[PDB]
Amino acid sequence: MILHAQAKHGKPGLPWLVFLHGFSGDCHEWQEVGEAFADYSRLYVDLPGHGGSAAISVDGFDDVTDLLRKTLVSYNILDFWLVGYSLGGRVAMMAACQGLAGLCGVIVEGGHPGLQNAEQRAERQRSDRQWVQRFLTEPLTAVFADWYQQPVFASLNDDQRRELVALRSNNNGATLAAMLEATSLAVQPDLRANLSARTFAFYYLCGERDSKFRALAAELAADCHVIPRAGHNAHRENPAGVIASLAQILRF
């Protein structure tokens, strides 16, 4: 078993760009940005519980990393960057730190490096448990209307929220719930020390208007690219700015 993905072949010999969406996303998330890198090969992955990988269940990050490894092998990917947004950024950091053969660098957009005490982990465990129950029992248009009013999405306007609710409501609430619990920030290690000692290149992207993750990026041993006029999902709101940042990172 491998993850569902969409592959696009670029110039032979250039690295693959392996894109990981965020929670409730799917393999289309990064395509507006990724297809700008037409000379690279692109792998747009559906994480467990998401898109065409809905039926793939995992118990935690070890299982996700293993699935990612198998997927890369299946596509004959030998030399690649991992590019992850939010949950996908956390998956990317976990997989990179656990070890992926052929990884040359990681680019994380708004991915949390980990909580730092038991109180915070308990709070997140409880909060994620409440969302899990909502995803199991409520109309997804109602759940996502509240999802996109969380603080990390405060910066959005009403039009943006309406569009996102409509988009994300194409999803399986049960498999979203299973994945939300399995890869909850509550169960993630604090990766700051590991990221500091990294063998792989590590870059951070953050929307200008994403106050939480601008502060987090400052705690990290990475070059941080602040994306103008963008919130947490900076590549969605300012794709041209994210393409420019990715070009600076990749082509140097």
Residue 233 binds ligand 164, judged by CB under 6 A = yes
Please report, as residue ranges, which positions from 26 to 85 form the binding site for ligand 164 (by CB under 6 A). none
Burial of 230 (0-12, 13-18, 19+ CB in 10 A): buried
Q: Which is nearer to ligand 164, 40 or 144 (CB)?
A: 144
Judged by beta carbon, residue 41 or residue 183, the one nearer ligand 164 is 183
204 binds ligand 164 per the rule CB under 6 A:
no
In the window 88-147, what residues touch ligand 164 (CB under 6 A)? 90, 112
The 8-class DSSP code of residue 7 comes to E
Of 14 and 192, the one with the shorter C-beta distance to ligand 164 is 192
Q: Are 171 and 164 in contact (CB under 8 A)?
A: no
Size, binding site for ligand 164 by CB under 6 A: 10
CB of 10 to ligand 164, least distance (A): 27
**22 counts as binding ligand 164 under rule CB under 6 A:** yes
Stretch that binds ligand 164, among 22-30, 64-72, 217-225, 242-250 (CB under 6 A): 22-30
**Per-state percent for the chain, helix, strand, coil, to nearest 5:** 45, 15, 40
To the nearest whole angstrom, how small is the minimum distance from the Cβ of residue 53 to ligand 164? 15
Tell me how far, at minimum, the Cβ of 48 lies from ligand 164, in Å.
13
Q: What tokens appear for 103 in the block?
A: 């990884």
Is 86 among the residues that bind ligand 164 (CB under 6 A)?
yes
152 binds ligand 164 (CB under 6 A): yes
CB nearer to ligand 164: pick between 90 and 209: 90
| CA dihedral over 143, 145, 148, 154, signed as positive or negative | negative
* Angle made by CA atoms 112, 43, 74, in degrees to the nearest 5: 110
**Closest distance between ligand 164 and the C-beta of residue 161, in Å?**
11
Contact residues for 113 (Cβ-Cβ < 8 A; gap 6+): 93, 190, 191, 192, 195, 216, 219, 220
Instruction: Name which of 208, 91, 73 is nearest 82 in CA terms.
Output: 91
87 interacts with ligand 164 by CB under 6 A:
yes
Among residues 104 and 212, whose Cβ is nearest to ligand 164?
212
Among the listed residues 4, 17, 20, 24, the single contact to ligand 164 using CB under 6 A: 24
Give the residue with the Cβ less far from ligand 164, 8 or 161.
161
Q: For 126-165, b where at least 16 C-beta lie within 10 A, e where not — what string?
A: eebeebbebbeeeebeebbeebbeeebbebbeeebbeebb
Site residues for ligand 164, 182-201, by CB under 6 A, read 185
Virtual CA dihedral for 169, 173, 176, 182, nearest 10 degrees?
Answer: 160
Token couple for 54: 């809905």
The residue ranges that bind ligand 164 (CB under 6 A) are 22-24, 86-87, 90, 112, 152, 185, 233
